[PDB]
Short mmCIF file of C-alpha atoms in Angstrom, two decimals:
data_model
loop_
_atom_site.label_atom_id
_atom_site.label_comp_id
_atom_site.label_asym_id
_atom_site.label_seq_id
_atom_site.Cartn_x
_atom_site.Cartn_y
_atom_site.Cartn_z
CA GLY A 1 0.00 0.00 0.00
CA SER A 2 1.90 3.01 1.32
CA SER A 3 5.60 3.50 2.03
CA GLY A 4 6.78 4.71 5.43
CA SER A 5 5.68 2.80 8.52
CA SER A 6 4.67 -0.85 8.26
CA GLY A 7 2.89 -2.94 10.89
CA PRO A 8 -0.19 -2.45 13.08
CA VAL A 9 -0.82 1.30 13.19
CA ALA A 10 -4.45 1.34 14.31
CA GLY A 11 -3.07 0.41 17.72
CA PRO A 12 -5.20 -0.94 20.59
CA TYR A 13 -7.66 1.17 22.57
CA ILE A 14 -8.22 0.92 26.33
CA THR A 15 -11.93 0.66 27.14
CA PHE A 16 -11.62 -0.61 30.71
CA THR A 17 -9.64 0.76 33.66
CA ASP A 18 -10.18 -0.30 37.27
CA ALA A 19 -8.13 -0.81 40.43
CA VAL A 20 -8.05 -4.42 41.64
CA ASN A 21 -6.26 -3.33 44.82
CA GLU A 22 -4.23 -0.58 46.48
CA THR A 23 -1.22 -1.83 44.53
CA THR A 24 -2.99 -3.62 41.68
CA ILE A 25 -4.86 -2.43 38.59
CA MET A 26 -6.90 -4.26 35.95
CA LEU A 27 -7.17 -2.80 32.45
CA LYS A 28 -8.59 -4.31 29.25
CA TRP A 29 -7.87 -3.18 25.69
CA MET A 30 -9.69 -3.77 22.41
CA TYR A 31 -8.52 -4.46 18.85
CA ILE A 32 -9.97 -2.80 15.75
CA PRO A 33 -9.44 -5.12 12.75
CA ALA A 34 -11.59 -2.97 10.47
CA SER A 35 -8.80 -0.45 9.88
CA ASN A 36 -6.12 -3.12 10.32
CA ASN A 37 -3.80 -4.91 7.90
CA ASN A 38 -4.78 -8.33 9.26
CA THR A 39 -1.21 -8.59 10.54
CA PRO A 40 -0.13 -10.95 13.36
CA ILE A 41 0.92 -9.33 16.63
CA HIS A 42 3.88 -10.52 18.71
CA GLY A 43 2.33 -9.45 22.01
CA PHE A 44 1.17 -6.44 24.00
CA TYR A 45 3.24 -3.84 25.85
CA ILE A 46 1.91 -1.85 28.80
CA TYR A 47 3.47 1.32 30.21
CA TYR A 48 2.79 2.85 33.62
CA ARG A 49 4.25 5.38 36.07
CA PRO A 50 3.24 7.49 39.10
CA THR A 51 2.40 11.16 38.59
CA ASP A 52 5.14 11.84 41.13
CA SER A 53 7.67 10.60 38.58
CA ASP A 54 9.95 13.03 36.74
CA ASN A 55 9.68 11.99 33.08
CA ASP A 56 8.92 9.07 30.77
CA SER A 57 12.28 7.75 31.98
CA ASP A 58 10.11 6.13 34.65
CA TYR A 59 7.47 4.69 32.33
CA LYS A 60 7.86 0.91 32.44
CA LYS A 61 6.99 -1.80 29.91
CA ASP A 62 5.06 -5.04 30.47
CA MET A 63 4.86 -7.54 27.62
CA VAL A 64 1.69 -9.60 27.24
CA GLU A 65 0.60 -12.44 24.96
CA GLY A 66 -0.67 -11.19 21.61
CA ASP A 67 -3.86 -13.16 22.17
CA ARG A 68 -4.38 -11.61 25.61
CA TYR A 69 -6.63 -8.57 25.97
CA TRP A 70 -6.31 -8.25 29.75
CA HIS A 71 -3.50 -7.48 32.19
CA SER A 72 -3.34 -6.89 35.95
CA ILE A 73 -0.57 -4.48 36.93
CA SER A 74 1.02 -4.68 40.38
CA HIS A 75 3.69 -3.07 42.56
CA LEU A 76 1.95 0.31 42.42
CA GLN A 77 1.23 3.10 44.90
CA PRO A 78 -1.98 3.24 46.98
CA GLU A 79 -4.61 5.90 46.30
CA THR A 80 -2.19 7.20 43.66
CA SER A 81 -3.90 8.78 40.66
CA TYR A 82 -1.48 8.33 37.75
CA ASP A 83 -1.78 8.14 33.97
CA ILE A 84 -1.68 4.77 32.20
CA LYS A 85 -1.24 3.61 28.61
CA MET A 86 -0.22 0.66 26.44
CA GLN A 87 0.85 -0.32 22.92
CA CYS A 88 1.18 -3.43 20.75
CA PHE A 89 4.04 -4.55 18.51
CA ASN A 90 4.91 -7.13 15.85
CA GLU A 91 7.64 -8.25 13.45
CA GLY A 92 6.45 -5.37 11.29
CA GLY A 93 6.76 -2.64 13.89
CA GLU A 94 5.38 -1.04 17.05
CA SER A 95 1.85 0.35 16.85
CA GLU A 96 0.60 3.82 17.81
CA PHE A 97 0.38 4.97 21.43
CA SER A 98 -3.01 4.17 22.96
CA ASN A 99 -5.00 6.80 24.87
CA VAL A 100 -4.12 8.04 28.36
CA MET A 101 -6.34 6.37 30.95
CA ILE A 102 -6.32 7.67 34.53
CA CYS A 103 -6.89 4.73 36.87
CA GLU A 104 -6.81 5.67 40.56
CA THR A 105 -5.69 2.81 42.81
CA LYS A 106 -7.33 1.88 46.11
CA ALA A 107 -6.59 3.52 49.46
CA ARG A 108 -4.03 1.70 51.60
CA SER A 109 -6.35 0.81 54.48
CA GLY A 110 -5.06 -0.59 57.75
CA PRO A 111 -5.72 -3.75 59.81
CA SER A 112 -8.63 -2.12 61.65
CA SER A 113 -11.75 -1.47 59.58
CA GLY A 114 -14.09 1.46 60.16
#
């Protein structure tokens, strides 16, 4: 077709963002084949970082099966509202950067409930 950037461009789109725990978060992404080149994906990368961070330098990367549309992040900060995003990749090349989803974790409660 065109000449420039090959691979899955459409990129995935996050349509679900919730906090499984004070240090855990569950987010699900969707795939739009319509505007896709029916190309096979290697997996799924997920970036995350606390708003307290300095720059992307913090943003991490979590690979996930290409057939997986769900991922539960861990080792996060409690009641910490930070931006979250993800992106897929394949032999062809990395896809576009998904949208920025703000998923606020749960409050780090104590042993005594109120």
